[PDB]
Structure 1
Amino acid sequence: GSHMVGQLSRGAIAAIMQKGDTNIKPILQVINIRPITTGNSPPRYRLLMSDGLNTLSSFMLATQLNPLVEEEQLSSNCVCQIHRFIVNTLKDGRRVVILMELEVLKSAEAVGVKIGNPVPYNE
């Protein structure tokens, strides 16, 4: 169902990818959270995020926000607002987005579903 897609910042992923500017506070849905296999401490999480229009896989959560993952406030289907993030462009042109500050607006249980049918950003 897509009747909640007005809750998400449609177009924010394309804007981050295209322009790389960080002076926005987009509202996104978490699609998945996976640990990066770094082989060392601390755990680090990579997130697949949706803005209702696209998904993007190259988000990394900052270490100070790990307790949100560990205590399940931040989990698949929740809706969150990003308050501070950094864009780092790799040598090959891909962009990693590091989420430094965020707020969970609606828990995974409260949302209950995946919102819309966002298309993977090409990429």
Structure 2
Amino acid sequence: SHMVGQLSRGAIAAIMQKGDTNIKPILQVINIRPITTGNSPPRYRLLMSDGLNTLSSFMLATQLNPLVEEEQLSSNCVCQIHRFIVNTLKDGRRVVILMELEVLKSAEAVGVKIGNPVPYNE
């Protein structure tokens, strides 16, 4: 019960504003899509939720591609992020690269979007 209490509420704002990387937040995957790479290996963009907010500017490190390609990491799964870095683009947007993560609960075991998160603004 209280499914939202499974997620690190407030982590998205903390990552995007304080830029603290010492945290190991538990987030839900809402959606995953490949992004166009020329002839580079595939790259995945994730829409993640901390229960309060969603954020669409997560990228998976390519070393984690098999998680997606063998379907252990998919929409609705709950993951703990163990290592990430934030990079800021020339235009001021920030991207969060997920380097290490652990799936705590598979999509099948969660089965739904937790809570009613709203998009994080900027």
Structure 1 regions of 5+ residues with no counterpart? Answer: none
Native 8 Å contact 1:33 1:46 kept in 2: yes
Hey, what does 1:32 align to over in structure 2?
A: 31
SS of 1:101's equivalent? strand
How far apart, in 2, do the equivalents of 1:107 and 1:23 lie? Answer: 25
How far apart, in 1, do the equivalents of 2:37 and 2:7 lie? Answer: 31
How far apart, in 2, do the equivalents of 1:105 and 1:40 lie? Answer: 33
Question: Which whole-Å deviations, capped at 9, do the CAs of 1:17-58 have from their partners, x for residues lacking one?
Answer: 111121110000000000111122200000000000000000
Query: TM-score if structure 1 supplies the norm length?
Result: 0.96
Native 8 Å contact 1:31 1:49 kept in 2: yes
How far apart, in 1, do the equivalents of 2:77 and 2:3 lie? Answer: 13
Q: Among the aligned pairs, what percent are the same residue?
A: 100
Cα-Cα RMSD: 1.0
How far apart, in 1, do the equivalents of 2:67 and 2:5 lie? Answer: 25
Query: TM-score if structure 2 supplies the norm length?
Result: 0.97
Native 8 Å contact 1:3 1:116 kept in 2: no
| Structure 1 stretches of 4+ moved >6 Å | none
